[PDB]
Structure 1
Amino acid sequence: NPESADLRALAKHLYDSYIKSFPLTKAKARAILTGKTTDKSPFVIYDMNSLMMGEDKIKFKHKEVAIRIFQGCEFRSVEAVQEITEYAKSIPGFVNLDLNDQVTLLKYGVHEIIYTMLASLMNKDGVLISEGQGFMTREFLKSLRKPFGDFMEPKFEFAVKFNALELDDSDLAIFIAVIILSGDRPGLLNVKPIEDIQDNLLQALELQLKLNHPESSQLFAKLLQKMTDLRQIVTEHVQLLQVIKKTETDMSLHPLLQEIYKDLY
């Protein structure tokens, strides 16, 4: 019971660091999406006129419309990498690792985390954008010219299945830590200390899901099985990006993403 006690202290610390690191939580996203009075309605982009109306109404942090939208999603990923790096530093043992292994774990982990957390902002019909101020429809994203028309479809397909697990922010905080502390990332110098941390995080996630979802049979196993889909999302994203880069020689990538993508293939 003292062993399980330490796992609860870890869960609490991770949930705390997650709230401090990520300004748009699943709790806030669901409040925006479902019309709760705690939060404000998003402007909906579903076509070219609504996009233009949106460009004026929303002041986006992040050229032909399909290229601008894709680049907008990539610049948001740059921001997500910054937030995920701040979160990773909070995971006990992470900053104690060899600096080069910290880089390797972030390199191979950040997109898996990005698309995990993106599901929090999605329903079957679209995705929250611009810190939840906007909502871009799935059908509008599907309507973009080749090779941009399908770029978000694998993320939506994953999200609909992932969201069926009904995880909250406290569950996701531990799950994203598990994804980062993967001892099987290519070119790790010291695997053992990473595996030891992941063992502790897996114990913490199992206990969290048992306490938080006591009527959800094998929720832990079903969540771990979702890491299969996550890997395929990232592989397919990197492959599509290789095509986009070559068809659109005028489209720039941030060096942070370029350096990550370079080794992903």
Structure 2
Amino acid sequence: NPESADLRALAKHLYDSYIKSFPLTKAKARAILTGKTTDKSPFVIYDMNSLMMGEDKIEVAIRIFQGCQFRSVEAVQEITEYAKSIPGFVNLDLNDQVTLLKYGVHEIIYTMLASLMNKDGVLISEGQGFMTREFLKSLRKPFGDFMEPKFEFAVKFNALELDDSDLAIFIAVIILSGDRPGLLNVKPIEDIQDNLLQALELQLKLNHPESSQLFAKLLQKMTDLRQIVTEHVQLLQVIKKTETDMSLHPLLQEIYKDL
């Protein structure tokens, strides 16, 4: 194990800072969704009466949507915290840091949203709740189509059966993309990712020694992420016209602006 030991140390570092940056890991999500407890069982929201009942322990479609955005802002904060811990990220040009976050934040958000999802719904409110897929689809349709692409991607992506130690390196690879529009110094970004991609390859080979070409399949999923992000920005462009009274968050505004 020559220089593979450096990649193992990098994997462990990213995983340690992953746990320190995201309070709801995939491990805790799967322990809740399956039923490995009686204290971690979520309250299930599936209709109007179960929503009103679940509003004790933390318009209707507007309220759910605003709740989504706030969770998204919090997620951007956590991803920012995690990004600062990627070796070399804070040593890059400041403009490039803003750019990498601006275009990577949502690909990671949907990637990690898969961890909170099954084919039937998605965990909410730090895992205290669980909103069903059909209830989200039953919302008034501009809002009813917002979560279905995330659910379809999550079904296909959860089949890879990645744990948190894999996802830490994977989302690090997403942040350090040298093909982002408007980057000033691409070469250093590509060097960091070259290291992150090596680390991810080794981690997937050791953690999934039977998953043939899991590295390639995981890399191919980034295509689906792009498509998901595109459909979302279009959907937002519809909501901005239909709902002239709803407010989009400034942080979310700066991310999607001129994307």
Task: Judge same fold: TM > 0.5, yes or no.
Answer: yes
Per-residue CA distance 1:107-138 (angstroms, 9 max, x = gap)? 00000000000000000000000010000000
What is the deviation of 1:56?
1.3
SS at 1:57's partner residue?
Answer: coil
Please list every run of at least 4 consecutive aligned residues from structure 1 whose deviation after the TM superposition is greater than 2 angstroms.
Answer: none
Structure 1 vs Structure 2 CA RMSD:
0.9
What is the deviation of 1:70?
1.3
Query: Does the alignment pair 1:196 with 2:191?
Result: yes
Are residues 39 and 193 of structure 1, via their aligned partners in 2, closer, same or farther at CA, if it must alter by over 3 Å? farther
Aligned to 2:37: 37
Runs of 5+ in structure 1 lacking a partner?
59-63
Moved more, 33-42 or 158-167: 33-42
- Whole-angstrom CA distance in 2 between matches of 1:57 and 1:94: 39
| TM-score, normalization by structure 1 | 0.96
Are residues 69 and 262 of structure 1, via their aligned partners in 2, closer, same or farther at CA, if it must alter by over 3 Å? same
Match of 1:134 among 119, 129, 137: 129
- Whole-angstrom CA distance in 2 between matches of 1:261 and 1:187: 14
Query: Does the alignment pair 1:237 with 2:232?
Result: yes
| TM-score, normalization by structure 2 | 0.99
Per-residue CA distance 1:59-90 (angstroms, 9 max, x = gap)? xxxxx111111111111110000000000000
Question: Percent same amino acid at aligned positions?
Answer: 100
- Whole-angstrom CA distance in 2 between matches of 1:224 and 1:38: 37
- Whole-angstrom CA distance in 2 between matches of 1:130 and 1:10: 31
What is the deviation of 1:37?
2.2
1:54-73 map, 5 Å = 54-58=54-58, 64-73=59-68
Are residues 167 and 187 of structure 1, via their aligned partners in 2, closer, same or farther at CA, if it must alter by over 3 Å? same
Given that 1:31 and 1:39 are in contact with CA atoms closer than 8 Å, whether structure 2 keeps it comes out as no
Given that 1:171 and 1:209 are in contact with CA atoms closer than 8 Å, whether structure 2 keeps it comes out as yes
- Whole-angstrom CA distance in 2 between matches of 1:21 and 1:39: 24
Aligned residue pairs, count = 259
What is the deviation of 1:38?
8.0
What is the deviation of 1:2?
2.5
Runs of 5+ in structure 2 lacking a partner?
none
